[PDB]
Design a protein around this nucleic acid. Structure first.
Ligand SMILES: NC[C@@H]1O[C@H](O[C@H]2[C@@H](O)[C@H](O[C@@H]3[C@@H](O)[C@H](N)C[C@H](N)[C@H]3O[C@H]3O[C@H](CO)[C@@H](O)[C@H](O)[C@H]3N)O[C@@H]2CO)[C@H](N)[C@@H](O)[C@@H]1O
Ligand SMILES: NC[C@@H]1O[C@H](O[C@H]2[C@@H](O)[C@H](O[C@@H]3[C@@H](O)[C@H](N)C[C@H](N)[C@H]3O[C@H]3O[C@H](CO)[C@@H](O)[C@H](O)[C@H]3N)O[C@@H]2CO)[C@H](N)[C@@H](O)[C@@H]1O
Ligand SMILES: NC[C@@H]1O[C@H](O[C@H]2[C@@H](O)[C@H](O[C@@H]3[C@@H](O)[C@H](N)C[C@H](N)[C@H]3O[C@H]3O[C@H](CO)[C@@H](O)[C@H](O)[C@H]3N)O[C@@H]2CO)[C@H](N)[C@@H](O)[C@@H]1O
Ligand SMILES: NC[C@@H]1O[C@H](O[C@H]2[C@@H](O)[C@H](O[C@@H]3[C@@H](O)[C@H](N)C[C@H](N)[C@H]3O[C@H]3O[C@H](CO)[C@@H](O)[C@H](O)[C@H]3N)O[C@@H]2CO)[C@H](N)[C@@H](O)[C@@H]1O
Ligand SMILES: [Mg+2]
Ligand SMILES: [Mg+2]
Ligand SMILES: [Mg+2]
Ligand SMILES: [Mg+2]
Ligand SMILES: [Mg+2]
Ligand SMILES: [Mg+2]
Ligand SMILES: [Mg+2]
Ligand SMILES: [Mg+2]
Ligand SMILES: [Mg+2]
Ligand SMILES: [Mg+2]
Ligand SMILES: [Mg+2]
Ligand SMILES: [Mg+2]
Ligand SMILES: [Mg+2]
Ligand SMILES: [Mg+2]
Ligand SMILES: [Mg+2]
Ligand SMILES: [Mg+2]
Ligand SMILES: [Mg+2]
Ligand SMILES: [Mg+2]
Ligand SMILES: [Mg+2]
Ligand SMILES: [Mg+2]
Ligand SMILES: [Mg+2]
Ligand SMILES: [Mg+2]
Ligand SMILES: [Mg+2]
Ligand SMILES: [Mg+2]
Ligand SMILES: [Mg+2]
Ligand SMILES: [Mg+2]
Ligand SMILES: [Mg+2]
Ligand SMILES: [Mg+2]
Ligand SMILES: [Mg+2]
Ligand SMILES: [Mg+2]
Ligand SMILES: [Mg+2]
Ligand SMILES: [Mg+2]
Ligand SMILES: [Mg+2]
Ligand SMILES: [Mg+2]
Ligand SMILES: [Mg+2]
Ligand SMILES: [Mg+2]
Ligand SMILES: [Mg+2]
Ligand SMILES: [Mg+2]
Ligand SMILES: [Mg+2]
Ligand SMILES: [Mg+2]
Ligand SMILES: [Mg+2]
Ligand SMILES: [Mg+2]
Ligand SMILES: [Mg+2]
Ligand SMILES: [Mg+2]
Ligand SMILES: [Mg+2]
Ligand SMILES: [Mg+2]
Ligand SMILES: [Mg+2]
Ligand SMILES: [Mg+2]
Ligand SMILES: [Mg+2]
Ligand SMILES: [Mg+2]
Lengths: 88, 117, 101, 73
RNA sequence: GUGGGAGAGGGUGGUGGAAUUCCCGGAGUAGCGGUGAAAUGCGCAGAUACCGGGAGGAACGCCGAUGGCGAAGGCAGCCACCUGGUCCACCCGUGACGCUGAGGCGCGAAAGCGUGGGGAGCAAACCGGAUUAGAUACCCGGGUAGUCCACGCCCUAAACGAUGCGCGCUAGGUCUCUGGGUCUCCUGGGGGCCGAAGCUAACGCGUUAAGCGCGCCGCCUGGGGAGUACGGCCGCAAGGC
């Protein structure tokens, strides 16, 4: 699954300032983690459609968050994309 | 020709018949009777009366092997399972016990349309 | 890593050398799959509700253990190979749940 | 009917997850191997639901019967 | 975000017992089976009933509910791994990041199709026995596809709550599943029943609205002709839109 240490690791890694949990950068980091993990699972288990729905939703949420970021702060957005390796 | 004297009475009661098989304590048949073994032929084999006769018959035949006591095992629901048991009870055989062994599935095998619903 | 309970039911007909031999392969394969043993209850042979491989009784071992999760199924697979090994059940440990407490 | 007693009322405290306690578990099975309903076990939903699984484990282990012959009759 | 919880939610690999069928063996003999009554059928190459051993396939009794989960179709032995959703508490972080959603994409019961397996039980078609005025049926005996698996198609339905999704507002009572709290009580989430106001042609609905409101989507416009014809698109086909 995802252990508290892996999670906290990426939370600190992407947090805007100390104590930052729910900022856009962090949320997108977390979501990217879960996506990579879940699409990894669905690499095998191509027959698990129910989980694929999950994936769809997670991607949708992520894409919304990024849309908002790129609207507000094109810098923070560019940074995020590069750092995580998304969108290209 | 054995001289057994203690054994098992298996009553197999269906809606079409009753078959009373009597065996030695290891389950090997000694004698058996049924609805059709007495004169009854058609539907009449499924009668409680036919069951009484089949019981009494198997028990006579079995006492001729010198049997005294039996353990009764009842398989199936059907008219005259109980009549069979009772005929056995005073057949002039001591019935030491009665047990309902009726096999039922943990749901493995699809029934004929007759039995589905 | 996660903590499981291992149940093994063995042949009641084992003499001392046979039984302790089996336990030896148990231990060695447990280690070989990376299972550290936290606790053990050997409850000896006991009566069964039904015959297991023609036998009216069985010999029960229990192990509380910590091991890698990716290894569990494969461990139990290996455990089962032994002929004298009749039953194997590996269970994720859980905190006891009481009624009338 | 079922006014005899409730199986939980007899017992003291005990671990409903404990698949090895045979004597306690046996109390929750009928004359046949069948798991008693709650109207008998006098358990709660969650409880009963746990009981069932642990009984099933005990059955696989050979400690409890899946089924049993009915005596008397 | 942190910390708790319930669950037939999903995928993979394991594995357990009951039963059916079959094969072997023992013991046993004159029938079994089946129906309204029967006959076909099975049985002296020894059936049925009984015990022991084996093989395989399929489905998981009790628990089991008026229950739970899932967007829907749907999901039920037990075990492990992998994985989706969700609820409660703390009030910690971001700061309108929201709702809906043509087209697109994906999922989609059963039956059906392709390749290759599998095939115990059941069983369209089919072969028979009855019933009947007839009986291309109901009932009885057999029985192929199929039902099972893998992979790829099909895209339908009384796919139903026949009730689009989101949010706010408008008495209570009662049962239940599942959280939390100063645990008789108070406070969330879910499933039922009776009912205030109100609505409804009526039946009924009524904080799980079919009440009062706002947003966005889909649809309707007398019955037959007809889900037909034509055209297009999809499909191996059946056929679908
Ligand atoms: N692949 C598994 C599935 O098997 C299905 O097969 C199942 C269906 O044909 C049928 O389901 C019926 C259902 O129609 C009806 N509404 C109620 C009935 N209790 C169900 O049956 C089921 O009930 C329970 C739970 O599984 C079990 O105890 C029972 O063994 C099972 N037959 O019983 C079968 C065995 O469960 C279908 N082929 C399909 O859904 C799918 O392929
Ligand atoms: N047992 C593992 C299961 O396998 C399922 O799929 C597998 C099982 O259905 C089946 O495995 C074996 C089969 O190889 C072998 N030829 C026969 C055996 N009876 C099967 O097992 C299964 O078959 C069916 C399920 O359809 C059940 O009736 C039966 O109880 C069950 N043991 O064949 C499939 C491929 O191995 C699913 N992955 C999931 O339910 C689960 O992991
Ligand atoms: N769902 C499968 C089964 O669920 C049970 O265990 C599952 C649930 O009890 C448990 O629920 C936990 C919850 O306790 C905890 N407070 C939060 C957690 N997110 C939940 O887990 C849930 O969400 C995550 C995604 O984060 C999913 O990966 C997971 O499948 C889902 N159950 O997560 C477990 C994993 O799914 C059964 N006891 C077990 O046999 C089996 O894992
Ligand atoms: N594998 C061959 C044998 O198939 C048998 O069963 C197979 C055949 O009896 C059956 O025939 C199917 C038919 O059902 C279905 N309605 C249509 C399908 N095209 C047919 O298939 C047939 O025809 C085609 C070409 O015409 C061939 O390529 C194919 O090999 C042949 N089976 O399809 C089955 C497989 O799905 C035995 N059960 C199996 O044990 C055995 O192995
Ligand atoms: Mg967890
Ligand atoms: Mg959402
Ligand atoms: Mg700006
Ligand atoms: Mg008859
Ligand atoms: Mg295992
Ligand atoms: Mg599941
Ligand atoms: Mg068998
Ligand atoms: Mg034989
Ligand atoms: Mg003949
Ligand atoms: Mg022959
Ligand atoms: Mg023998
Ligand atoms: Mg046998
Ligand atoms: Mg629902
Ligand atoms: Mg339904
Ligand atoms: Mg705040
Ligand atoms: Mg909050
Ligand atoms: Mg601020
Ligand atoms: Mg939407
Ligand atoms: Mg797309
Ligand atoms: Mg489909
Ligand atoms: Mg199908
Ligand atoms: Mg096919
Ligand atoms: Mg099959
Ligand atoms: Mg048939
Ligand atoms: Mg006919
Ligand atoms: Mg007529
Ligand atoms: Mg006709
Ligand atoms: Mg005719
Ligand atoms: Mg025939
Ligand atoms: Mg037929
Ligand atoms: Mg569509
Ligand atoms: Mg409906
Ligand atoms: Mg409703
Ligand atoms: Mg509903
Ligand atoms: Mg939404
Ligand atoms: Mg409490
Ligand atoms: Mg529901
Ligand atoms: Mg009124
Ligand atoms: Mg009115
Ligand atoms: Mg009405
Ligand atoms: Mg009402
Ligand atoms: Mg409520
Ligand atoms: Mg329309
Ligand atoms: Mg339309
Ligand atoms: Mg018109
Ligand atoms: Mg017109
Ligand atoms: Mg049509
Ligand atoms: Mg056309
Ligand atoms: Mg074409
Ligand atoms: Mg055409």
């Amino acid at each position: 699954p995802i252990t508290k240490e892996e999670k906290q690791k990426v939370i600190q890694e992407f947090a805007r300032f100390p104590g930052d949990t729910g900022s856009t950068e962090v949320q997108v980091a977390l979501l990217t983690l879960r996506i990579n993990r879940l699409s990894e699972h669905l690499k095998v288990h191509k027959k698990d459609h129910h989980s694929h729905r999950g994936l769809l939703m997670m991607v949708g949420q992520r894409r919304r968050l990024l849309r908002y970021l790129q609207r507000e702060d094109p810098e923070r957005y560019r940074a995020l994309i590069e750092k995580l390796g998304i969108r290209g | 020709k054995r001289q057994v004297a203690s054994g098992r009475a298996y009553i197999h009661a269906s809606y079409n018949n009753t078959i009373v098989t009597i065996t030695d304590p290891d389950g090997n048949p000694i004698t058996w009777s049924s609805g059709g073994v007495i004169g009854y032929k058609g539907s009449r084999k499924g009668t409680p009366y036919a069951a009484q006769l089949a019981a009494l018959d198997a028990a006579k035949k079995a006492m001729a092997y010198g049997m005294q006591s039996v353990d009764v095992i009842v398989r199936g629901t059907g008219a005259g399972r109980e009549q069979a048991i009772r005929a056995l009870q005073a057949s002039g055989l001591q019935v030491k016990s009665i047990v309902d062994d009726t096999p039922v599935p943990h749901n493995g095998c699809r029934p004929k349309k007759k039995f589905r619903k | 890593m996660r903590r499981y309970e291992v149940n093994i039911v063995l042949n009641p007909n084992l003499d001392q050398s046979q039984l302790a031999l089996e336990k030896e392969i148990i231990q060695r394969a447990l280690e070989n799959y990376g299972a550290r043993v936290e606790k053990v209850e050997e409850l000896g042979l006991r009566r069964l509700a039904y015959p297991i491989a023609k036998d009216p009784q069985g010999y029960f071992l229990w192990y509380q253990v910590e091991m890698p999760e990716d290894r569990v199924n494969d461990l139990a697979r290996e455990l089962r190979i032994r002929d004298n090994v009749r039953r194997v059940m590996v269970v994720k440990s859980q905190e006891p749940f009481l009624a009338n407490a | 009917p079922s006014r005899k007693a409730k199986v939980k009322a007899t017992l003291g405290e005990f671990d409903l997850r404990d698949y090895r306690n045979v004597e306690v578990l046996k109390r929750f099975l009928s004359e046949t191997g069948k798991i008693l309903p709650r109207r008998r076990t006098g358990l709660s939903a969650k409880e009963q639901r746990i009981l069932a699984k642990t009984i099933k484990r005990a059955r696989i282990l050979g400690l409890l019967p899946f089924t049993e012959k009915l005596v008397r009759k």
